[PDB]
Amino acid sequence: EYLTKDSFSYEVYGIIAMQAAYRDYDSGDAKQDDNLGGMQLNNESRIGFRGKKQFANFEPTFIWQIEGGYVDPSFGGEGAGLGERDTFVGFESASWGQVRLGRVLTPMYELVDWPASNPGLGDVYDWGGAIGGAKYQDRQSNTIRWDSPMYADKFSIDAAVGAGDKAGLGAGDDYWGGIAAHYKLGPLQLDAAYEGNRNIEAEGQTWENNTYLVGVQGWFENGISFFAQYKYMEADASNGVNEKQDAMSAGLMYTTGDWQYKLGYAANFDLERDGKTLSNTSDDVVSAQIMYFVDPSAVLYARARMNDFNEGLDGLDDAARWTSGTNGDYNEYSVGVEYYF
Amino acid sequence: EYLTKDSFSYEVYGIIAMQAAYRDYDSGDAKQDDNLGGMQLNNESRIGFRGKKQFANFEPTFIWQIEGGYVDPSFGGEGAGLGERDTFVGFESASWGQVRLGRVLTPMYELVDWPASNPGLGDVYDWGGAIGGAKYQDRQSNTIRWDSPMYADKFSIDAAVGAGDKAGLGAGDDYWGGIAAHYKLGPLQLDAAYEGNRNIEAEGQTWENNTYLVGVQGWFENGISFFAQYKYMEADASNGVNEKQDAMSAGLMYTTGDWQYKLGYAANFDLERDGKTLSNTSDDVVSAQIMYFVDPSAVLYARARMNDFNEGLDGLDDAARWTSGTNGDYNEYSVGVEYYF
Amino acid sequence: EYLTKDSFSYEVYGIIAMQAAYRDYDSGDAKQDDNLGGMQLNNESRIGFRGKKQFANFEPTFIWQIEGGYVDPSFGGEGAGLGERDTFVGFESASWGQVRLGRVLTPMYELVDWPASNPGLGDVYDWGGAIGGAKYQDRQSNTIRWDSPMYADKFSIDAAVGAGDKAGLGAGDDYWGGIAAHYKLGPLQLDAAYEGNRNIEAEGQTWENNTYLVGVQGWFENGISFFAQYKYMEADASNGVNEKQDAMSAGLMYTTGDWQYKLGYAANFDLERDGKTLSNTSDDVVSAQIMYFVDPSAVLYARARMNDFNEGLDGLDDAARWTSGTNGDYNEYSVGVEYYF
Ligand SMILES: CCCCCCCCOCCOCCOCCOCCO
Ligand SMILES: CCCCCCCCOCCOCCOCCOCCO
Ligand SMILES: CCCCCCCCOCCOCCOCCOCCO
Ligand SMILES: CCCCCCCCOCCOCCOCCOCCO
Ligand code: NA
Ligand code: NA
Ligand code: NA
Ligand code: NA
Ligand code: NA
Ligand code: NA
Ligand code: NA
Ligand code: NA
Ligand code: NA
């Protein structure tokens, strides 16, 4: 008659996240600036379901999750389905960690996103950049991913392979594989990652991409913390063209009582095609944030950032290649709340 | 081990609503009548999640809600995302009421919908009418809305501002602001509202709209209740054209034991453009309903209505302006159930 | 303060289902084979809500359900809305069974799907076939369905009528009706069903379809179980053309301890148009499966199947008629898990 934790085979969880963001664009076209700029709300709130089950006849515990998408992001319409964010089944056991099948972050993307896309560094460092093909996937369906245990309390590995975007619709044979490693050393964590994408169809060619990342995170007792990463992207097209572009991201934090101050910087350097530097193909971003720990489950923040994007380039089909800079440079001021349950 | 109300940081709620609706169209084209008319089911059922949190370091209580859309409405395909209906975050405190950010009803729209679009008066009084620009938003994303407390147990105010439909996609600079007030006087409630829409792009112009509303609702001890509203819509286009149209809606109810009888009527009067009446631009609807209070949480109803729409007009670009009458006049018989938990 | 079953007016339920499926196509075009074939994950996981209410003033119990769609199927993108699968309201009472309004399986479709489309026989026997018009609906909105009680513990009937696919959007006047009956006697069940579709618009004509089904299922105590069905499809177009096609499906199972071995076969025979057999319009599939009962609430399985589809035909507008064979023959190896809560 009376319920316990065991009465249910699932848990609802949520991230309630609302940002009010004012953008000021300087694209060169005043109408486009009026259109893209101004105040919006960016509602990144999402609901998920998850659970576990010890099957009677198999030792590794079954796990599963189904996570909804952002319910009303800026620049988009209302509503999200279930299964748009990390959504998987899997198994776990103490001695070998976990394996997940479904829709998860790639090992490389996970590091690109956290720590290195925060606060607002993502237009440059996440999906920014000018390279052809596919530098990496991000959250990707049709994936198998292994997460190792924390060996000797210090070292862990994440490895995955998956189908590409066209392959997932029965429209291509693209695929990828990736791996990351993490090592904890006193106040530091060292990070390294790789992703290779193959059979990528774009601009009339087939591409292979290889992306490499090295990074550090540190947390010191006097309240200073930081991160830094360097990311190296290479791409080869089936007509013989080679491209390379590198990038970096860094952040510095000072935490005192219920406050975190943060500065962030990220940059993509000029792209190189067949040994030649394409001028003005770099991007950068500077960001400042103050965050208040309003509760153990929530934060309030204020943020200011300035994005200075590349001036454009063509792809290998002689048409403009789309980048995060195609819509122009902008600055943004924002405030927000996030709450976790 | 045993659960309480406090074990969860969310509540699921729902409105389970099904209507079987038979429409008989008289559009002037027999094939169109056959297509638009006939029996459908209108499943307006929806699920929502909501909760609150007292943040340790902030006095006003945090509130949130994520509401799904109608799961299978008539004239539409199956399935709704989370966040299609009222979906927001906010804060509340006894002395100042509540503030919500996200997707909510405008102050004007809320009164236009309830009481004045029920039962089935909405084709005329909600989204019906012939005026250019945007007479008002309805449920709108990118909104901040304040709801005052009930001052002196009599008077309350709802005020809001938000981004327009194009601005929410980064495709324009439309916006709007609105306010409503409610005053209790014996068995009556008096209502007034305003909305102003700006930078609305349509028919090759930019438009400003101003809409005003005044109303009454009454509930008497002998079982009679009623509502009546008058609504005045004005619009100015950037080429100098002015338009005006007004409207009304009224309803009379008799409640006895577990039954409510209801008659409803709404009309849009002829539109005026630059001081000249456009003939046959009016609409009206008459509706009758019997409702049974089948449970404290539910109702059953039967409803009959007749819609007589305008005979068409052009917009300022010399093409037909779409209205709720464009698909033709129709009558409708329906039965339904609604249940709340 | 403490919660019971009665504290909630709804239950969450789910089917967590993941299949890893490798397809090898032989379409005649090596690029198309590369595109459609390869490994995908087919995530058929879904979440639902359901509940009941005894209304104070009505004896038949109110029932409802809202079921989400597959969260990330193969050949499709991520995310599903609530209300994509069986989503309805209804009433139930011991003496007359249940009545549902909304989105449910048709009586014919329910038998076509289970037992007769498992394991992987659906390309041929569910949506396969070459006949014009609409052989039957499957899961359909705008439906009323009655499920009788089990009379004398042996005999039951399911009957339904509904609006068609165009009618549901206000774009046509299609409709259907169907019925099925089941008789249980010792270790056998006999099945029979019918569906008639009317006013179906396709290929420049209006169609009527009539589809008939007879079947048997058996379950014996020595671990042998089986099913077999015969399905007869007839269609008449408004220009006088008659089409007929028949089909079958059968399966044999052997269950011992926690294992089920299964073989399945289904076929569509050559279609006949105006008394003439259209050569090479048949399809068939053979499938083998081993299933392990890993828990009382879950299964693991491995499956191999070979599909051999028709070589194409034209519809009555002299263009290719789409069938489940249009993309070419393929074989498939898969493994999966399903778990129910
Ligand atoms: C980007 C890297 C940021 C590094 C932040 C500083 C980390 C720690 O600095 C404080 C050093 O702690 C040792 C204290 O040294 C002073 C000791 O003086 C003598 C008293 O015993
Ligand atoms: C302690 C680490 C210090 C690292 C300093 C290296 C900074 C590199 O800055 C230049 C990279 O290019 C980014 C600037 O791009 C701006 C956009 O350019 C407009 C036309 O491309
Ligand atoms: C508080 C009592 C409210 C009394 C409501 C009376 C409403 C009168 O009916 C108006 C509907 O008129 C329908 C057709 O008339 C068209 C004339 O156009 C100009 C409007 O004055
Ligand atoms: C369409 C033809 C498929 C026929 C397969 C029938 C095989 C079933 O074997 C039954 C023999 O049973 C011997 C053992 O009986 C144990 C008690 O069973 C009670 C009835 O299930
Ligand atoms: Na804008
Ligand atoms: Na939005
Ligand atoms: Na991708
Ligand atoms: Na119709
Ligand atoms: Na519908
Ligand atoms: Na709007
Ligand atoms: Na493929
Ligand atoms: Na998929
Ligand atoms: Na259908």
Three-class SS of B92-103: EECCCEEEEEEE
Residue corresponding to tokens 């960001």: A287
Query: Does B72 touch chain C if contact means CB atoms closer than 8 Å?
Result: yes
CA neighbor of A172 nearest in space, from A206, A144, A145, A149? A206
How many angstroms separate the CA atoms of C64 and A63, rounded? 29
* Record: contact A35-B143, CB cut-off 8 A: no
Strands C87-93 and C97-105: antiparallel
How many angstroms separate the CA atoms of A125 and A248, rounded? 7
| Contacts by residues C158-167 (CB-CB < 8 Å, ≥ 24 positions apart) | C158/C107, C158/C110, C159/C107, C160/C104, C160/C106, C160/C107, C162/C106, C162/C137, C163/B38, C163/B39, C163/B40, C163/B41, C164/C134, C164/C137, C164/C197, C164/C199, C164/C200, C165/C134, C165/C137, C166/B35, C166/C201, C167/B38, C167/B40, C167/C142
How many angstroms separate the CA atoms of A8 and A3, rounded? 9
Single-letter code of the amino acid located at A338: E
DSSP C156-188: EEEEEEEE-TTGGGTS---EEEEEEEEEEETTE
What's the gap in Å between B181 CA and the centre of ligand 5? 30
CA neighbor of B11 nearest in space, from C269, C315, A12, C341? A12
Single-letter code of the amino acid located at B215: G
The residues pairing with C41 across neighbouring beta strands, listed in sequence order, are C20
Q: How many CB atoms lie within 10 A of CB A95?
A: 6
* Least distant ligand from the CA of C142: 9
Mutate to test the interface with B, among A16, A19, A338, A340 (most CBs of B within 10 A): A16
Residue corresponding to tokens 């929502």: B48
How many angstroms separate the CA atoms of A37 and A311, rounded? 19
Query: Does B166 touch chain A if contact means CB atoms closer than 8 Å?
Result: yes
Q: Is the CB of B248 under 6 A from ligand 3?
A: yes
* CA-to-CA separations, C309 to C124, C277, C281, in angstroms, rounded: 8, 16, 8
Single-letter code of the amino acid located at C266: A
Name the token pair of B189: 């409630």
Q: How far is CA A339 from the centre of its chain?
A: 20
- Residue C185 CB burial class (10 angstroms; 0-12, 13-18, ≥19): exposed
**Three-state secondary-structure class, residue B68:** strand
DSSP C111-128: HHHTTTTTTTTHHHHTS-
**Overall resolution, Å:** 2.0
Name the token pair of C31: 């690029």
How many angstroms separate the CA atoms of A331 and B186, rounded? 54
* Record: contact A9-C40, CB cut-off 8 A: no
Mutate to test the pocket of ligand 3, among B191, B269, B310 (most ligand atoms within 8 A of CB): B269
Q: Is the CB of A224 under 6 A from ligand 1?
A: yes
- Contact status, residue B20 vs residue B341, Cβ threshold 8 Å: no
Contacts of A186 (CB under 8 A, 6+ apart): none
Q: Which atom of ligand 4 is nearest to the CA of C226?
A: 3
The residues pairing with A15 across neighbouring beta strands, listed in sequence order, are A46, A340
What's the gap in Å between C165 CA and the centre of ligand 9? 9
Classify residue B176 by its DSSP letter.
Answer: E
Q: Which residues of chain C does A169 touch, with a Cβ-Cβ cutoff of 8 Å?
A: 75-77
- Contact status, residue B99 vs residue B145, Cβ threshold 8 Å: yes
The residues pairing with B208 across neighbouring beta strands, listed in sequence order, are B236
Burial B302-322 (b: 16+ CB within 10 A, else e): ebebebbbbeebebbeeeebe
Q: Is the CB of A220 under 6 A from ligand 1?
A: yes
Q: How many helices (H) and strands (E) does chain B have?
A: 3, 19
Closest to B53 (Cβ–Cβ): which among A38, A300, A339? A339
Q: What is the dihedral of CA C123, C129, C132, C136, to 10 degrees?
A: -60
Query: Does C5 touch chain A if contact means CB atoms closer than 8 Å?
Result: yes
How many angstroms separate the CA atoms of C47 and A83, rounded? 10
Query: Does B1 touch chain A if contact means CB atoms closer than 8 Å?
Result: yes
Q: Is the CB of B313 under 6 A from ligand 3?
A: no
Helix (H) or strand (E) run with residue A230 in it: strand A224-237
Name the token pair of B250: 């009224």
Q: How many CB atoms lie within 10 A of CB B250?
A: 20
CA angle (A245 as vertex; A243, A251 as ends), nearest 5: 165
Strands A11-26 and A38-43: antiparallel
- Contact status, residue C294 vs residue C327, Cβ threshold 8 Å: no
* Record: contact B163-A40, CB cut-off 8 A: yes
First to last CA, chain A: 26
How many angstroms separate the CA atoms of A165 and A176, rounded? 10
R_g (Cα) of chain C, nearest Å = 21
Strands A82-93 and A38-43: unpaired
Q: Is the CB of B291 under 6 A from ligand 3?
A: no
Strands A188-202 and A205-219: antiparallel
Instruction: Give the number of A-B residue pairs with CB atoms closer than 8 Å.
Output: 132
DSSP A252-320: EEEEETTEEEEEEEEEEPPPEETTEE-TT--EEEEEEEEEEEEETTEEEEEEEEEEE-----B-TTSSB
Closest to B75 (Cβ–Cβ): which among C66, C89, C170? C170
CA neighbor of B73 nearest in space, from B102, B103, B42? B42
* Least distant ligand from the CA of A125: 2
Single-letter code of the amino acid located at A85: R
CA neighbor of C128 nearest in space, from C277, C215, C229, C233? C233
**HSE value, Cβ hemisphere, 13 Å, CA-based, for A99:** 7
Closest to B296 (Cβ–Cβ): which among C56, C81, C101? C56
* Record: contact A4-B1, CB cut-off 8 A: yes
- Phi, psi torsion values for C168, nearest 5 degrees: -60, -15
Cis peptide before A107 (omega within 30 of 0): no
Classify residue B223 by its DSSP letter.
Answer: S
What's the gap in Å between B167 CA and the centre of ligand 6? 9
Residue corresponding to tokens 């100015």: B236
Mutate to test the interface with C, among B3, B7, B11, B16 (most CBs of C within 10 A): B16
- Contact status, residue C125 vs residue C249, Cβ threshold 8 Å: yes
The residues pairing with B25 across neighbouring beta strands, listed in sequence order, are B330
- Residue C287 CB burial class (10 angstroms; 0-12, 13-18, ≥19): buried
- Contact status, residue B124 vs residue B246, Cβ threshold 8 Å: no
- Phi, psi torsion values for C174, nearest 5 degrees: -70, 150
Sign of the torsion angle spanned by Cα atoms C54, C57, C59, C65 = negative
- Contact status, residue A139 vs residue A95, Cβ threshold 8 Å: no
Task: Please tell me which chains touch B, using 3 or more CB pairs under 8 Å as the contact test.
Answer: A, C
Distance from the Cα of A323 to chain B's closest Cα (Å) equals 17
What's the gap in Å between A160 CA and the centre of ligand 6? 33
Distance from the Cα of B55 to chain A's closest Cα (Å) equals 5
How many angstroms separate the CA atoms of C81 and A287, rounded? 36
DSSP A138-187: SEEEEEEEEE---BTTTEEEEEEEEE-TTGGGTS---EEEEEEEEEEETT
First to last CA, chain C: 27
Mutate to test the pocket of ligand 2, among A227, A270, A277, A308 (most ligand atoms within 8 A of CB): A308
Cis peptide before A296 (omega within 30 of 0): no
Single-letter code of the amino acid located at B200: I
Contacts of A43 (CB under 8 A, 6+ apart): A17, A18, A19, A70, A71, A72, A73, B83, B87, B88, B89, B102, B103, B141
The residues pairing with A228 across neighbouring beta strands, listed in sequence order, are A216, A250
Contacts of B213 (CB under 8 A, 6+ apart): B108, B111, B112, B191, B192, B193, B194, B229, B230, B231, B232
- Phi, psi torsion values for B122, nearest 5 degrees: -75, -30
CA neighbor of B218 nearest in space, from B184, B177, B261? B184
Contacts of B192 (CB under 8 A, 6+ apart): B180, B181, B212, B213, B214, B215
Sign of the torsion angle spanned by Cα atoms A322, A323, A324, A326 = negative
How many angstroms separate the CA atoms of B243 and B234, rounded? 6
Name the token pair of B177: 């602001």
Single-letter code of the amino acid located at B206: T
**Three-state secondary-structure class, residue A73:** coil
CA neighbor of A50 nearest in space, from C14, C50, B2, C41? C14
CA neighbor of A324 nearest in space, from A138, A120, A123? A123
Name the token pair of C114: 């289970």
What's the gap in Å between A186 CA and the centre of ligand 1? 14
Query: Does A165 touch chain C if contact means CB atoms closer than 8 Å?
Result: no
Cis peptide before C296 (omega within 30 of 0): no
Strands B298-308 and B283-295: antiparallel
CA angle (A38 as vertex; B159, B199 as ends), nearest 5: 70
CA angle (A26 as vertex; A25, A27 as ends), nearest 5: 105
CA neighbor of C237 nearest in space, from C192, C277, C284, C204? C204
**Three-state secondary-structure class, residue C299:** strand
CA neighbor of C307 nearest in space, from C138, C122, C130? C122
Contacts of C302 (CB under 8 A, 6+ apart): C289, C290, C333, C334, C335
Q: How many CB atoms lie within 10 A of CB A164?
A: 23
- Contact status, residue B250 vs residue B264, Cβ threshold 8 Å: yes
* Least distant ligand from the CA of B31: 8
Classify residue A2 by its DSSP letter.
Answer: B
Provide the domain count of chain B: 1
Query: Does C40 touch chain A if contact means CB atoms closer than 8 Å?
Result: yes
* Least distant ligand from the CA of C215: 4
Sign of the torsion angle spanned by Cα atoms C109, C112, C118, C120 = negative
Q: Which atom of ligand 3 is nearest to the CA of B226?
A: 1
DSSP B135-160: S--SEEEEEEEEE---BTTTEEEEEE
Q: How many CB atoms lie within 10 A of CB C152?
A: 7
CA neighbor of A163 nearest in space, from A171, A173, A175? A175
How many angstroms separate the CA atoms of C74 and C76, rounded? 5
The residues pairing with B303 across neighbouring beta strands, listed in sequence order, are B289, B334
Q: Which atom of ligand 1 is nearest to the CA of A220?
A: 7
Single-letter code of the amino acid located at A332: E
Atom 12 of ligand 4: nearest residue by CA position: C222
Q: What size, in residues, is chain A? A: 341
Burial A71-83 (b: 16+ CB within 10 A, else e): bbbbebebbbbbb
Closest chain C residue to the Cα of A49, Cα to Cα? C47
How many angstroms separate the CA atoms of A263 and B46, rounded? 43
* CA-to-CA separations, A115 to A126, A215, A217, A253, B197, in angstroms, rounded: 11, 10, 8, 12, 42
CA neighbor of A340 nearest in space, from A307, A293, A270? A293
H-type helices in chain C, by residue range? 30-36, 107-113, 122-125
- Contact status, residue B334 vs residue B20, Cβ threshold 8 Å: yes
**HSE value, Cβ hemisphere, 13 Å, CA-based, for C74:** 23
The residues pairing with B245 across neighbouring beta strands, listed in sequence order, are B233
Query: Does B77 touch chain A if contact means CB atoms closer than 8 Å?
Result: no
Query: Does C31 touch chain A if contact means CB atoms closer than 8 Å?
Result: no
Contacts of C58 (CB under 8 A, 6+ apart): B294, B295, B300, C91
How many angstroms separate the CA atoms of A184 and A153, rounded? 8
How many angstroms separate the CA atoms of B309 and C259, rounded? 66
First to last CA, chain B: 26
Q: What size, in residues, is chain C? A: 341
Query: Does B76 touch chain A if contact means CB atoms closer than 8 Å?
Result: no
Mutate to test the interface with C, among A64, A104, A138, A166 (most CBs of C within 10 A): A64
Contacts of A135 (CB under 8 A, 6+ apart): A129, A195, A197, A209, A211, A233, A235
Q: Which residues line ligand 2 (CB under 6 A)?
A: A 267, 269, 280, 282-284, 308, 310-311
Q: Which domain holds residue A112?
A: 1-341
Q: Is the CB of A222 under 6 A from ligand 1?
A: yes
Q: How many CB atoms lie within 10 A of CB C29?
A: 12
How many angstroms separate the CA atoms of B5 and B64, rounded? 17
**Three-state secondary-structure class, residue A70:** coil
Query: Does C149 touch chain B if contact means CB atoms closer than 8 Å?
Result: no
Name the token pair of B170: 């980064």
Atom 17 of ligand 3: nearest residue by CA position: B269
Mutate to test the pocket of ligand 2, among A216, A277, A282 (most ligand atoms within 8 A of CB): A282
Q: Which residue ranges of C are tagged as binding site for Mg(2+)?
A: 140, 165
CA angle (A163 as vertex; A160, A165 as ends), nearest 5: 125
